[PDB]
Amino acid sequence: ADTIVAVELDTYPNTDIGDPSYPHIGIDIKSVRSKKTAKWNMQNGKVGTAHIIYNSVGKRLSAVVSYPNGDSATVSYDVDLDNVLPEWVRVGLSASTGLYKETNTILSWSFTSKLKTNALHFVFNQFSKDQKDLILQGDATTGTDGNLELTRVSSNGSPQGSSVGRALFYAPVHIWESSAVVASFDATFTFLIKSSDSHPADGIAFFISNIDSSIPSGSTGRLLGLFPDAN
């Protein structure tokens, strides 16, 4: 199965599989049941920004999600990604809806990994119809209003259900290297989760996985496009 690490922006509490019973951000290590989470207020319809930070030195994966009004949620988790990820990965974004749904619009995404140096840095503030440096998967499409919609949206402006989608950066990343003194990465992305459903679902993740990683099957709704199941 795909080796996955992820920061999840989890708009839907699936508390029969580990979610806390609020909207939450989570660090996911090889499982969809977050090693760590934090209560997150998903502000409907607002543009949000997620920052994920990790370095090999402090070995603490962190993520803040916040919105323009100042609310903000943080999560950190002490872990050595040298022991969970393969040397070469892909990075990307993943989203899903299920029974409930939302827009999973990504408005920008930037990523930096370094190995001190080797370094890879990319930034998308405007995505194209034909984004040739993004591998799109499942429902994800880009363009031409400069957005990445990771989950199937519908003409009048509408989040459908039972949708998954991800975009990985095309180039694989060398995310660690054992002689590296420092192997760090940060990623940032801004998103617009909107819903008029009774509850939005299910969320946006930033993820690193093996380079060949795909959408496991039946991974919509609560498995966020990251896992074959909820183990």
Ligand X SMILES: O=C(O)Cc1c[nH]c2ccccc12
CA distances from 89 to 19, 85, 98, 170, 214 (A): 27, 8, 27, 10, 12
Contact flag: residue 222 with ligand IND (CB under 6 A): yes
Give the Cα separation of 94 and 107 in Å (integer): 14
The closest of 51, 172, 177, 63 to 120, measured between CA atoms, is: 172
User: Where do contacts with Mn ion occur on this chain (CB under 5 A)?
Assistant: 10, 19, 26
200 binds, among ligand X, ligand IND, Mn ion, none (CB under 5 to 8 A by kind): none
User: Where do contacts with Ca ion occur on this chain (CB under 5 A)?
Assistant: 10, 12, 14, 19, 222
Give the Cα separation of 168 and 162 in Å (integer): 20
In the complex with Ca ion, which residue's Cβ is closer, 194 or 222? Answer: 222
Instruction: Give me the least distance between CB of 190 and ligand X, in Å please.
Output: 5
The owner of tokens 């499982």 is 31
Is 130 one of the annotated binding-site residues? Answer: no
228 backbone φψ class: left, alpha, beta (φ>0; ψ -120 to 50)? alpha
Instruction: Give me the least distance between CB of 201 and Mn ion, in Å please.
Output: 11
Of 13-21, 76-84, 180-188, 207-215: span binding ligand IND (CB under 6 A): 13-21
Is 14 one of the annotated binding-site residues? Answer: yes
The pair phi, psi for residue 106, each rounded to 5°, is -100, 115
Is 152 one of the annotated binding-site residues? Answer: no
Binding residues: 8, 10, 12, 14, 19, 24, 99-100, 202, 222
Binding residues for Ca(2+): 10, 12, 14, 19, 202
Binding residues for Mn(2+): 8, 10, 19, 24
